[PDB]
């Protein structure tokens, strides 16, 4: 709304999790730069009093900061003039059983803000609007039902007078949908499902008119056998982007359910799709399915980054996105035209390549998955070559700094029944480091990319996956947190590490920045968890547990322990 | 199955060699229970009704109450 | 043993929780001083992955640091060359029920070291010796039985080839005793009980020969009616001191049980006693009962500080101690002679004064407790004007920097039966700030004292109780953590605050210091809890809950939340 | 009762005015059960035996085992 716009236009404020409507996750604040970053020190810290993975990052509105924890999803409001005083706090009362239907740790990716309210959700499915100054609950509504395996983890997204909120639960057969609510009252405006009839999916009359070969009408049911789409997944628990001029919001729908591909023949549209929907009606102007008939759990929910750059010398309105499937996509955000579809690392083998003309992945049968067969050395793994991390874009050099994962896998599915409220996976995995790390053990990378060509500029390897993402600040610095507990700053020119601080626990969110009384501050959550930390968090040791994640990250607990809090830095 | 043979635009799925074109009746038949399949829709219907009541009550009373009945 | 002595004599090492055998909790490291403390910054941090109160402080042996958490009592070994790597760790498997019989949060006051081993205990009563380099368990024995309400929280204490360990549980009628074990094998050498026959209490033939009026033989039973001494408390869960030349160790025994004084007529010896015992035999050379027939839960377990200073011009081997009862005691540590017994704050009203000739408190009936009566405005409260905090002593200016509590109370007892495994308190309290704070709301003080006169030199007030204690370093600095989350440094000359840092959560341990690669580091645990934080930690709101502590500390949760870890600072 | 009137050195307790010198038989009689009172000693005896066994086995075998029997 107008109030959110006011904050967005306020220098040094941070009212949106992804850094702005275009979700470039960057900042013009340049007080901290390449020459003085070595002098950055901790300013203060704040513990949430909660363990488990602490995703997302705090919001800064005016002189107030809002911090959030993992389940039970607590909110803490602080006035930057005195970080020692909790102005107000909201501590939800939720049934412990809520955690039992959360697939990948009891994480929360953050708060949102609009109309002078902090918009927050709870894992148990409630969405609330609290007064930003007092914490008073203005409205509280139900969005997801944990009894059928549906929960809330993603950050809400505010645009105009609408709050976009998507439920999680594809691992439990939850049929995904982006739900839209009135920012002032919490009333349901509409919801656009990822599968089913065109009416339920909310497709515009001219849906994909620019690219009919992507598929248009009737595919939400025609690309499934019978009613399999009813428990077909497609949940959107990642991030959104919004272009005010076009009045289009963008996001990606998740993986189809179950993981057992043999149980759901068909392209399974519209799961794994990049969307361009009208904000007012939710009607899709365009939709591009990145991974038809998923066979690897490449949940297509990753960040959408909107930029305006010259493509072959021609200024173009773009949308860029690095999917779990290891492909960096760049499309025209107005009509959905496919411009770039390149592998972020040569290890990607599920596809020989993505054909720009047919618009689909040229599949390599050797790395497919199917019943009564154990696929091996498949890249990327289900954790993908990119997950929930929020990357940053430098508008000057026109570079995206991507936090990647370099993990591959073995996979064999198996038959299982669907029972609402219970998991519906149907696959056994083994995950391990990809083949290209310097010592073949590295699982993380910070890799810079030109979004108009998909070509990399440089790479910095990390022992563990770069799960949280990166933040770019005008001083020429790429900030990011590691699973082993460090907040780091790199020279955006070559990836050279210029500064680091050992936080209490690994970070799984992306850094944020703000200004307060003449100084630039860098904020990062800490508290390892999420999918990579399930072994440590839930005391698991079986390599196959955590769907293969436990074995892959077995060494993480030798570098970090759980935690939960925020650390702030400055000069 | 390389994804490049489409029966119709946007519908390029093909059964892999040795696997059926239709799983109903095959050894890969999921045999899903319609009652279970419809549970999400049923829950959403009830949930939408509960929210509608909260919205209506808040509008008429001027104060928002989650537990209104 | 000899190995411990080697570490004690190693500049920059920290092998003993209290700073050394005399427990002066100080350091000759002067790199950080009054002139440059303003430049101190966070060096690194480490989360334990555990919540609840994090008492004590880490140990530093050579280039290795050992960190400990609250229950389940985990141990983490880090080499200072790379704090990011956990060389080895020990994470105990204990029954969750153990927490149910712990009176005052599931805290752990620290590790000990001897014969190349880290000596660690567990709340469930186990005491272990682990190789300091590999973490291999050399021995593990049972010391306390949680089934009868006995647990372990205090830090073990190593002297020569002996490990001293005392069980907690007076609130559950546990009969206290100092248990002595062989450092190499874990074999029980002997145990000296706080109540009962002289044989069980282990009194030397010349016990109190220098002060017969203190009482000598047969009082362990004669000052009780019948067998009430069997469940008479007297647990020692505080700190120890040791004089190698005299081969005497010192400590204080706790409060008698139950809290209901009417249920246990008699002086209740030897609870509330300052002891001087031979290390090899455990036989007491002298014993001074500070609080005969306790009526306020003034558990006499506080720190014992050994110093050698002139008393009115004559050099004397001293022992100083600030009891829960609000009295600062200084005795001759060789024979037990009473030299000083002054109120640490004029608000103390349970006693008119302590008579130096009779050696006993001159009780004021107006502030006693008894059945069918509600005592009001009694000072100190059960939390005492001093609790488990470890204070520091500056040998140059000869000053003790005490972390005090300024809390008083209302108290009324009630009858209740004894059942092993169940609480045995029998009193309802109300606690609130003392009458002398600047705004009459302050509950904490850092007060400097001359131990030979008991007179104060200066006072710095704190909103909340100074629970953790203080550390003194030669640069002229008094370091301490606050319940609201700050680590602070004061000018030791006047108490002026020179530096502070907002840690993630309140600190309830005392700071430690060490040197590595020519640099001085200050280390402090963080993670609020203990008695002051029971309201926040256990979600309590009843003001009378936590035995009155909840009401008194109702505002703490508006300044801090739980946490668990270590923060290290340096220039 | 100011603690200054001692019947014997180190034994200065006095009943407060209006309270009994001995609580046995009074309205403040704790009526503690003898067997219940001895529970701690009984526990320590058994515990000491378990430790003795661990110590003995460690010395004869050369390896320390907590659960030995
Ligand atoms: O299908 C879904 O609805 C769903 C939900 C979530 C979530 O909301 O945490 C994850 C995933 N899938 C899973 O694909 C995944 O890779 C994942 C990682 C994490 C995390 O926070 O580390 N969450 C999720
Ligand atoms: O009687 C006992 O054995 C016993 C044990 C403990 C403990 O070990 O934590 C405390 C106390 N009493 C109690 O007197 C007290 O003031 C207290 C505070 C704390 C703390 O860590 O904050 N523990 C204890
Ligand atoms: Ca998924
Ligand atoms: Ca006590």
What distance in angstroms lies between residue C106's CA and the mean position of ligand 2's atoms? 10
Q: Which residues pair with A340 in a beta bridge?
A: A330
Sign of CA dihedral D47, D53, D56, D58: negative
Q: What is the strand order of the sheet C241-243 is part of?
A: C241-243, C248-252, C273-278, C284-289
C501 touches chain A (CB under 8 A): yes
Q: φ and ψ at A107, to 5 degrees?
A: -80, 160
What's CA C460's distance to the chain center, in Å? 21
Q: Tell which phi-psi region holds residue A311, choosing left (phi > 0), alpha (psi between -120 and 50) or beta.
A: beta
What is the Cα–Cα distance from A363 to B64, expressed in whole angstroms?
53
Q: Report the greatest alpha carbon distance in chain D.
A: 65
Half-sphere exposure for C8 (CA within 13 Å, toward CB): 22
CB nearest C49 (choices: A41, A559, A561): A561
Q: How far apart are CA A159 and CA A183, in angstroms?
A: 9
Distance between CA C23 and CA C333 in Å, rounded? Answer: 13
Contact A386, A134 (CB under 8 A): no
Question: In sequence order, what are the residues at sequence separation of 6 or more whose Cβ sits closer than 8 angstroms to the Cβ of residue B22?
Answer: A225, A265
Rounded Cα distance between A68 and A130, Å, is 13
User: Which DSSP string do the residues of A36-77 spell out, in sequence order?
Assistant: TGGG-EEEEEEE-S--S---S--EEETTEEEEE-STTT-EEE
* Region at A125 (left for phi over 0; alpha for psi -120 to 50; beta for the rest): left
End-to-end CA distance of chain C: 34
Rounded Cα distance between A381 and A297, Å, is: 8
**Chain B interface residues (partner A, CB cutoff 8 A):** 1-4, 6, 8-13, 15-16, 19-24, 28, 30-34, 36-41, 43-44, 47-48, 50-51, 54-55, 58-59, 64, 66
CA gap A203, B12 in Å, rounded: 20
**Residue with the two structure tokens 């606690």:** C431
Longest Cα–Cα distance in chain C: 63
Residue C173 CB less than 6 A away from ligand 2:
no
Phi and psi angles of residue C324, each rounded to the nearest 5 degrees, phi first = -60, -30
Give, as one character, the DSSP assignment of residue A89.
E
Question: Regarding beta strands A126-131 and A137-142, do their DSSP bridges make them parallel or antiparallel, or are they unpaired?
Answer: antiparallel
Residue A371: Cβ within 10 Å count: 19
- Which residues touch A485 (CB under 8 Å, ≥6 apart)? A502, A503, A504, A505, A506, A507, A526, A528, A559, A560, C84
Q: Hey, which residues 438-497 in chain C have their CB within 8 Å of chain A?
A: 484-486
Give the ligand at the shortest distance from the Cα of A169. Answer: 1
String of DSSP letters for C131-186: ETTT--EEEEEE---GGGT-B--SPPEEETTEEEEE-B-GGGT---EEEEEETTT-
Is omega for the bond preceding A270 within 30 degrees of 0, making it cis?
Answer: yes
Quote the strand ranges of A194-244, DSSP E: 241-243
Q: Which residue has the tokens 């947190």?
A: A481
Phi-psi region of C534 (alpha: psi -120 to 50; beta: other; left: phi over 0): alpha
Closest alpha carbon to A370 in A488, A486, A245, A264: A264
Place of tokens 């790597």: C85
Between chains, do A41 and C46 touch, taking CB under 8 Å as contact?
no
Name the 3-class secondary structure at C113: strand
Resolution at which this structure was determined, Å: 1.5
Rounded Cα–Cα distance for residues C107 and C54 (Å) = 6
Are the C-beta atoms of A265 and A338 separated by less than 8 Å?
no
Give the residue numbers of A annotated as catalytic, written as ranges.
297
- Under a CB-based contact definition with an 8 Å cutoff, are residues A530 and A105 in contact? yes
Subunits with 3+ C-beta pairs closer than 8 A to C: A, D
Distance CA C426, CA C294 (A): 14
Q: With beta carbons less than 8 A apart as the criterion, state whether C238 and C298 touch.
A: no
Q: Is A531 in the pocket of ligand 1 (CB under 6 A)?
A: yes
Tokens of A103: 């697939």
Q: Is A558 annotated as a binding residue?
A: no
CA distance C202 to C204: 7
Computed on alpha carbons and rounded to an integer, the radius of gyration of chain D in Å comes to 23
The position carrying tokens 């040795």 is B18
C235 close to D (CB below 8 A): no
Q: Measured between CA atoms, how close is A91 to chain C, in angstroms? A: 11
CA–CA gap between residue A52 and residue A50 (Å, rounded): 7
**Distance, CA of A258 to CA of B30 (rounded, Å):** 11
- Secondary structure, 3-state, A352-413: EEECCCCCCEEECHHHCCCCCCCEEEECCCCCCCCCCCECEEECCCCEEEEEEECEEEEEEE
Touching B: A residues 472-501, CB under 8 Å: none
Provide the token pair at C444. Answer: 């904490």
Cα separation, D19 vs C180, whole angstroms: 40
| Contact: C230, D41; criterion CB under 8 Å | yes
Where are the alpha helices (H) located in A414-548, listed in sequence order? 534-537
Angle at CA A28, nearest 5°, toward A23 and A29? 120
Q: Which of C388, C528, C550 to mutate to test the pocket of ligand 2 (most atoms within 8 A of CB)?
A: C388
Rounded CA separation C443/C437 (Å)? 7
Of B15, B33, B55, the CB nearest to A186: B55
**Beta-carbon contacts of residue C16 (< 8 Å; ≥ 6 apart):** C4, C8, C23, C59, C112, C113, C158
B1-69: CATH homologous superfamily?
Methanol dehydrogenase, beta subunit (4.10.160.10)
| Contact residues on chain D for C365, CB-CB shorter than 8 A | 1-2, 16
Ligand 1 closest atom vs CA A532:
22
- CB C376, CB C418: distance < 8 Å: no
SS (H, E, C) chain B: CCCCCCCECCECCCCCCCCCCCCCCCCCCCCCCHHHHCHHHHHHHHHHHHHHHHHHHHHHHCCCCCCCC
Give which of C127, C121, C136, C281 is closest to D55, Cα–Cα: C127
Out of D21, D40, D48, closest to residue C174 by CB? D40
Question: Which residues on chain A are in Cβ contact (under 8 Å) with B20?
Answer: 265
Q: Cβ contacts (< 8 Å) between A501 and chain C: which residues?
A: 42, 44
- Write the burial class of residue A436 (CB in 10 Å: 0-12 exposed, 13-18 middle, 19+ buried): middle
Work out the burial of residue C62: count CB atoms within 10 Å of its CB; fewer than 13 is exposed, 13-18 middle, 19 or more buried. middle
- C370 touching chain A per CB within 8 A: no
CA distance linking residue C547 with residue C428, whole number of Å: 6
Q: Does C215 touch chain D (CB under 8 A)?
A: yes
Provide DSSP, C481-515: E-TTSEEEEEETTT--EEEEEE-SS---S--EEEE
Q: Across the interface, which of A45, A503, A562 has its CB nearest the CB of C502? A: A45
Q: How far apart are CA A563 and CA C501, in angstroms?
A: 19
Q: What are phi and psi of A534, to 5 degrees?
A: -60, -35
What whole-number distance in Å separates Cα of residue B66 and Cα of residue B62? Answer: 13
Distances (CA, A) of A102 to A68, A150, A375, C45, C294: 18, 8, 27, 30, 53
Ligand 2 pocket, residue C151 CB under 6 Å: no
Contact C399, C492 (CB under 8 A): yes
User: Which CATH number applies to C1-571: 3.40.50.2000, 3.30.479.30, 3.40.1190.20, 2.140.10.10?
Assistant: 2.140.10.10
Q: Which residue has the tokens 């990390």?
A: A462
CA C109 to chain CA centroid, nearest Å:
8
Distance set, CA C359 to CA A132, B23, C20, C454, D7 (Å) = 61, 93, 30, 16, 15
CA separation, residue C240 to residues A549, C18, C20, C155, C317 (Å): 47, 8, 10, 9, 16
Query: How far, in Å, from the CA of A411 to the mean position of ligand 3?
Result: 15
Residue A70: name the closest of A511, A562, A420, A486 by CA.
Answer: A562
- D64 and C140: CB-CB below 8 Å? yes
> Per the structure block, which two tokens stand in for A156?
């809400």
Exposed/middle/buried for residue A228 (C-beta within 10 Å: 0-12, 13-18, 19+): buried
d(CA C287, CA C340): 16
DSSP C12: T
Strand partners of residue C445? C404, C461
Interface test with A, best of B10, B45, B55, B68 (most A CBs within 10 A): B10
Q: What is the DSSP string of D2-66?
A: -S---SBTTB---PPTTS-S--TTSTT-----HHHHTHHHHHHHHHHHHHHHHHHHHHHHSS--S
């Amino acid at each position: 709304d107008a109030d959110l716009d006011k904050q967005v236009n306020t220098a040094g404020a941070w009212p949106i999790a992804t850094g702005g409507y275009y979700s470039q996750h960057n900042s013009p604040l340049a007080q901290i730069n390449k020459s003085n970053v070595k002098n950055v020190k901790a300013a203060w810290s704040f513990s949430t009093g909660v363990l488990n993975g602490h995703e997302g990052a705090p919001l800064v509105i005016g002189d107030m900061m809002y911090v959030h924890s993992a389940f039970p999803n607590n909110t803490y409001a602080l006035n930057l003039n005195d970080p020692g005083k909790i102005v107000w706090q909201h501590k939800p009362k939720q049934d412990a059983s809520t955690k039992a239907v959360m697939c990948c740790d009891v994480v929360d990716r953050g708060l949102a803000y609009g109309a002078g309210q902090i918009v927050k959700k709870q894992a148990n499915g409630h969405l609330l609007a609290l007064d930003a100054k007092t914490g008073k609950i203005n409205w509280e509504v139900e969005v997801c039902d944990p009894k059928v395996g549906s929960t809330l983890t993603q950050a809400p997204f505010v645009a105009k007078d609408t709050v976009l909120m998507g439920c999680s639960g594809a691992e439990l057969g939850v049929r995904g949908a982006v739900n839209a609510f009135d920012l002032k009252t919490g009333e349901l405006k509409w919801r656009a499902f990822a599968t089913g009839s065109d009416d339920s999916v909310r497709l515009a009359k001219d849906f994909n008119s620019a690219n009919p070969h992507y598929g248009q009408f009737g595919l939400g049911t025609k690309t499934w056998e019978g009613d399999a789409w009813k428990i077909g997944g497609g949940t959107n628990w990642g991030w959104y982007a919004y272009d005010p001029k076009l009045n289009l919001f963008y996001y990606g729908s998740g993986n189809p359910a179950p993981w057992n591909e043999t149980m759901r023949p068909g392209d399974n549209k519209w799961t794994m799709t990049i969307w361009g929907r009208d904000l007012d009606t939710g009607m899709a102007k365009w939709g591009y399915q990145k991974t038809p008939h998923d066979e690897w759990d490449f949940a297509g929910v990753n960040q959408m980054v909107l930029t305006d750059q010259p493509v072959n010398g021609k200024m173009t309105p773009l949308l860029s996105h690095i999917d779990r499937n290891g492909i960096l996509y760049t499309l025209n955000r107005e009509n959905g035209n496919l411009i770039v579809a390149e592998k972020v690392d040569p290890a990607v083998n599920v596809f020989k390549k993505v054909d720009l003309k047919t618009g689909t992945p040229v599949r390599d049968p050797e790395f497919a998955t199917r019943m009564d067969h154990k696929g091996t050395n498949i890249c990327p793994s289900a954790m993908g070559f990119h997950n929930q991390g929020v990357d940053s874009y430098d508008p000057e050099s026109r570079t995206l700094y991507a936090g990647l994962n370099h993990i591959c896998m073995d996979w064999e599915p198996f038959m299982l029944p669907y029972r609402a409220g219970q998991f519906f996976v149907g696959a056994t995995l083994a995950m391990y480091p990809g083949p290209n790390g310097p010592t073949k053990k590295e699982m993380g990378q910070i890799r810079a990319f030109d979004l108009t060509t998909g070509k990399a500029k440089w790479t910095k390897w990390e022992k563990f996956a770069a799960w949280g993402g990166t933040l770019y600040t005008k001083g020429g610095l790429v900030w990011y947190a590691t699973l082993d507990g460090y907040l780091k700053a790199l020279d955006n020119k070559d990836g050279k590490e210029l500064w680091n601080f050992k936080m209490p626990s690994g970070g799984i969110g992306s850094p944020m920045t703000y200004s307060f009384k003449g100084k630039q501050y860098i904020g990062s959550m800490y508290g390892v968890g999420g999918w990579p930390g399930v072994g440590l968090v839930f005391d698991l040791t079986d390599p196959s547990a955590g769907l293969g994640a436990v074995g892959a990250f077995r060494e993480l607990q030798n570098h970090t322990q759980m935690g939960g809090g925020l650390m702030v830095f400055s000069l | 199955y390389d994804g490049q043979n489409c029966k119709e635009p946007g519908n390029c799925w093909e059964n892999k060699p040795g696997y059926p074109e239709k799983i109903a009746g095959s050894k890969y038949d999921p045999k899903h229970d319609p009652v279970e399949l419809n549970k999400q829709e049923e829950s959403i219907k009830a949930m939408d009704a509960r929210n509608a009541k909260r919205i209506a009550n808040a509008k008429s009373s001027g104060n928002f109450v989650f537990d209104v009945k």
